[PDB]
Structure formats: structure tokens, C-alpha cells
Amino acid sequence: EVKGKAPLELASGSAMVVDLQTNKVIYANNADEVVPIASITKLMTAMVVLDAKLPLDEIISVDIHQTKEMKGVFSRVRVNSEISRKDMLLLALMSSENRAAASLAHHYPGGYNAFINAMNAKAKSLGMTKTRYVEPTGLSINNVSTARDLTKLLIATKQYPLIGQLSTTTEKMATFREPNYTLPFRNTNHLVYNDKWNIQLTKTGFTNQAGHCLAMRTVIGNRPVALVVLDAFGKYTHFADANRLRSWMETGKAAPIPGAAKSYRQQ
């Protein structure tokens, strides 16, 4: 086992992997490039809700009128219908449900604008100096961060067990009222159904401008790690990069990335 690990090369534009028991960087590539993070915004939305210590069992209404980016966006979640704050957090984290994420910011002491301000105040308190939030869903391309800043956010999520628990929920039959209707929801990360993965927290995002993004807390062997991959050009490049990091940390062997991925990065 003296051989050692061969050079690791991911296909994603930016990436960072950190040991959560020492906060030491395992891998870093262009980790300071500002990029749109889309639905990874919902991790901050959940943190802001949990910091307010609002009752999770409270039944709240679907309200999205202050989120301009939600205008005209399709959702199976009906406006004015109601479900627990905990269920709205679950839908936002497991399924990236945009109306659920927006509704959480419309049921916050101090109002919607205060919620957005609290998102930015939390980023500042965590040293996320290149991060900016303008709305709670991630639909805005102006929700930006870096692989390093999202690593700081993943480290902070350790202090909020419910974020990781709801984000790794495999499926959920959600029951709403006003009026009554039930919706089936599944996790956006197929890796949660793979028994070869040990995931504590997972969140994905996608924009046409930067492509696929993935932030996860996972146990690889006997090492809890934070994994952030951003600007993944190819459709499953983010999941493939996670599998590359995992297989590499287990065997020390790295898989050569495809030409199309190699091209995008080199450009």
C-alpha cells in the first residue's frame, strides 16, 4: 500500500473535497471561481428556517408571490394549499421543490426581505465571502457561490442534523389540504438508492449557464468527507465525478475522464 494514490482529475469546472474530522483539503480544483449554484441555494434556505427555531409541526400555506422568479414556473404544489413546515423543508431538500422553498421564506418572523437578508448574514458569519443570495429557491442565476464557500456551508450543516436527514430521504407521499390532494416525491440524487453509498446530506442543482452542481456529505471508507462539484458540463458529469472521488479514495486508482469533458475543462 506504499504505492500511493495516482493524480486525481475530475471533469467538473470546479471541485473541492474536505476531510470533516480535520477540515483538511483532500482535493481542490478552481475552488474559488464564482458560479451560479441553482437549487444548492435550498441548503441555506433550510439553515435560515432552522436558525429561527420555528415549529416544524406548524401547518403553513403555499405562498410564492414575493419570489418574482417563480412567476409562470410550473409546480404540482398548488398555491394557498397547506402542509407542515417540516414537509415543506423535506420537499425543498429531497426533491428541490421550488414552491416549497419559496413558501418557507414567506412564513418567517420579520418577513420575506428579512429572510433573504438572513441568508446573506449567515454566508458572512461562515466566511463565505464570494457567495450571494437574492431569493430562496435557486431559480435566480444571481444566486452564486464557489466550491470553497459551499464546502464551508457543508461543514456548517453538520450542526443541523435535520437538513441531512430530509435531503437523503429516498421517497415521500406528501398530503396537502385546502384542498386535499397527495403527491409522490423522490430524491433528485439516485446515489441515495445505491447501497455502495453512505450519504449524510445531498443537494443537486442545474442551470444552462454553468451546468450540473452537487454538494454532499458522505462517508468514503472510514472518512466522513464534504464533496462539492460545480460547472459539470456533461449530463451525469457531477454523479460520475462523485463516483471517481469515491472509487479513487477506496482503491487509489483514478478513471480517465471522457474527451468531451476533458475538452470543456481545457477550454
Q: Which of 197, 238, 184 is nearest to 40 (CA)?
A: 238
- The answer to whether 203 is annotated as binding is yes
Q: Which of 105, 100, 119, 115 is nearest to 41 (CA)?
A: 119
Q: Is the dihedral of CA 72, 77, 78, 82 positive or negative?
A: negative
Q: Report the number of secondary-structure helices (H) and strands (E) in the chain.
A: 8, 11
Whether a cis peptide bond, with omega within 30° of 0, leads into 179 is: yes
Distance separating alpha carbons of residues 242 and 218, to the nearest angstrom = 10
CA angle 73, 120, 151 (to 5 degrees): 90
Distance separating alpha carbons of residues 260 and 95, to the nearest angstrom = 29
Largest CA distance in the chain: 64
Q: Active-site positions? A: 39, 42, 96
Distance separating alpha carbons of residues 26 and 37, to the nearest angstrom = 22
Q: Specify whether the CB–CB gap between 35 and 230 falls below 8 A.
A: yes
Distance separating alpha carbons of residues 205 and 190, to the nearest angstrom = 14
Residues of the binding site for substrate: 203
